[PDB]
Amino acid sequence: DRPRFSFSIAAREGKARTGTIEMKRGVIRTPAFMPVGTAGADIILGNTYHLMLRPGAERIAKLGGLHSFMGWDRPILTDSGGYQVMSLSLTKQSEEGVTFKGSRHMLSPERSIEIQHLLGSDIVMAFDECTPYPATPSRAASSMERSMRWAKRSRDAFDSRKEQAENAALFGIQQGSVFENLRQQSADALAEIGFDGYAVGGLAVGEGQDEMFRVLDFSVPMLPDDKPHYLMGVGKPDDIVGAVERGIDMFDCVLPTRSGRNGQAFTWDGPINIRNARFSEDLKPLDSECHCAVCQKWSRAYIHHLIRAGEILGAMLMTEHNIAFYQQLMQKIRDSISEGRFSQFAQDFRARYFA
Amino acid sequence: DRPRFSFSIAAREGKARTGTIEMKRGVIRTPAFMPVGTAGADIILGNTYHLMLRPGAERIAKLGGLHSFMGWDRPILTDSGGYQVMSLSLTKQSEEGVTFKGSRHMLSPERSIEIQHLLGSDIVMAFDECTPYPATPSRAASSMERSMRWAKRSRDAFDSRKEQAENAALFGIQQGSVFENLRQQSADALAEIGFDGYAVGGLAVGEGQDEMFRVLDFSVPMLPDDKPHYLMGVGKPDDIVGAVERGIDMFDCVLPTRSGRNGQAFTWDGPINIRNARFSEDLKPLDSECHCAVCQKWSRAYIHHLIRAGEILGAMLMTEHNIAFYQQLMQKIRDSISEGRFSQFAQDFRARYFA
Numbered sequence A, B: 001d002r003p004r005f006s007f008s009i010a011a012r013e014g015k016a017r018t019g020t021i022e023m024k025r026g027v028i029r030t031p032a033f034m035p036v037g038t039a040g041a042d043i044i045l046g047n048t049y050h051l052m053l054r055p056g057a058e059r060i061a062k063l064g065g066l067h068s069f070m071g072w073d074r075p076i077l078t079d080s081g082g083y084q085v086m087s088l089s090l091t092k093q094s095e096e097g098v099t100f101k102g103s104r105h106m107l108s109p110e111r112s113i114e115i116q117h118l119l120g121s122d123i124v125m126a127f128d129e130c131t132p133y134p135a136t137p138s139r140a141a142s143s144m145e146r147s148m149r150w151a152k153r154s155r156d157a158f159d160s161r162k163e164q165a166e167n168a169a170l171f172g173i174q175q176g177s178v179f180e181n182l183r184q185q186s187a188d189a190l191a192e193i194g195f196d197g198y199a200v201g202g203l204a205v206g207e208g209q210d211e212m213f214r215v216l217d218f219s220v221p222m223l224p225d226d227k228p229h230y231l232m233g234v235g236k237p238d239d240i241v242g243a244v245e246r247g248i249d250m251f252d253c254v255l256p257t258r259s260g261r262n263g264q265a266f267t268w269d270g271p272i273n274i275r276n277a278r279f280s281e282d283l284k285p286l287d288s289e290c291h292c293a294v295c296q297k298w299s300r301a302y303i304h305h306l307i308r309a310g311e312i313l314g315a316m317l318m319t320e321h322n323i324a325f326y327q328q329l330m331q332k333i334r335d336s337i338s339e340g341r342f343s344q345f346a347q348d349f350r351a352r353y354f355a
Ligand SMILES: Cc1ccc(CCc2c3nc[nH]c3cc3c(=O)[nH]c(N)nc23)cc1
Pocket: A036, A045, A046, A047, A048, A079, A080, A081, A082, A083, A084, A125, A128, A129, A130, A131, A173, A200, A201, A202, A203, A204, A205, A232, A233, A234, A252, A253, A254
């Protein structure tokens, strides 16, 4: 029987590492990409913010939990909901939590953990504040300090629910904006509380890749080495490669699905916009090396035709290819680290992706 | 090696029959449902009118023909294009053909057959005029007479193209609106020319089921018994069952795909609108007996959730289920005719579908 949670590192190269997370519902190979569930992957993302509202967490629990609801019996990660509340909802912030608007709702550390319990997710995120960017040192500090108080409240709420404490895992989220001293204080606070994994929050908020990598350079080494590192909200293939080079083990990102519904396909030679007329007679698959079922069977010209015609089949094929591309990217990353040639892979990847 | 075209009737019950069409690219079991290709089926529909315009028939031929383009190596049926021109395009009609509007286009019997040749379809429809409904006897007669002149021109154009004459099949289309004498004259004209199959045109144009069935009652027996009978544009499951009872062998219909993108699922207990709140907690599959992969795996509640959330996955699952339902309907029809219990099947089908 697999454990509740066990992270093992099988190989390293520089700051990069590759290994596995064992959980009751399955093994997660790292570095991992975690696609949205409503879009092969070892874990998918649930959408706490949406599910809170439709049908409601209680209702999901009445229907048997998210695994039964979605027909997915493997691990599920849920975010804590405040990021989405603050980006999508009127909002009122206080030390207790956030209220937002049919009727009004409060979201607190305790309520966030309970919602994630009712959904039945396997990896639960602490309830944090994603500090807006840019932020002054004072505002970034005040925000991070609140998030750390909230992290302790999240820990206690999780531990109070036996079914959750015994079968799920809890990740703490580091904040501190772009400031090294605050990132250190946040890492220290999270390690004192103790979590199963550690996320780097507060990035992919408009800072750009150079700045993101700069913050990762000093921030990831502050986290416990023997625990998984999750960079929230990232990203493009080139962001993933550089974040793995800096010690990240887990990724989520809307882009594969967003791109698949909006005409963009990822390839080893960079993204392409399949609606462009240059693809109307292109008999090659979306990508020349991709092993996915779309590229085994259909051409750029046909997918172009479907998308231009407004056919649902087109977006479905684009999305299948994109998620498959991301999983091939992660497999190549894992294999290259395990083989000690990840540094060469990253250089080769970049030379070709940007050519 | 299969023949170019061979229709064999294996069993009959009343006017209903079941059998096979053999063509070079495959066997078609009848009665057959023929789904749109861009949406198991033995033949799919190409969209002549759309393909004429984007990318153009020449361009499709340059890309290797529709089979290669779509990745479908089995039979393809194409319509002749005038129905769609007259419903979707400014139009100018003459004895030569129809002109319509970027720039202008003409469609004639000769051009329609050439377009269908360039597309490479296996079953080619004659270029006809679908008479509007209602029509006076005089207008219905004038229109039908033009269609029969056009049917002869279609026959001659098809026969002039060796690759087409030797590898494809040509169907003539009966017109005559709702008038028995004109339907007879049209059938007589088509049989004198000689076709591989015979379609009943000019229905599913707003006449309603009672009137459609009334016209089928006298029209289908006018066609050669030993050739397939294709009712164009039909229809709902109950239309299909009644048309088979009246001697129809082949069906096309937008409904499965249109419905799948618009929240409607077909079930043995009738259509359901999955967006309705009554399905938000319904743990049953879309249909309790359906063998399709959607109903094996997911609930009404989950598909409702996806559609209400605007997720592409939802429409895809609805469409897969709907096309699968139609193929199960046709399999049950074929089996019940072969077993001599089709009359009982139709009564049982109706009692339940409308309960
Ligand atoms: C469905 C879904 C997908 C992804 C996410 C992650 C959302 C996300 C961020 N996205 C971009 N930058 C982000 C930063 C944070 C952050 O600091 N905290 C949290 N809790 N989430 C973040 C949430 C929900």
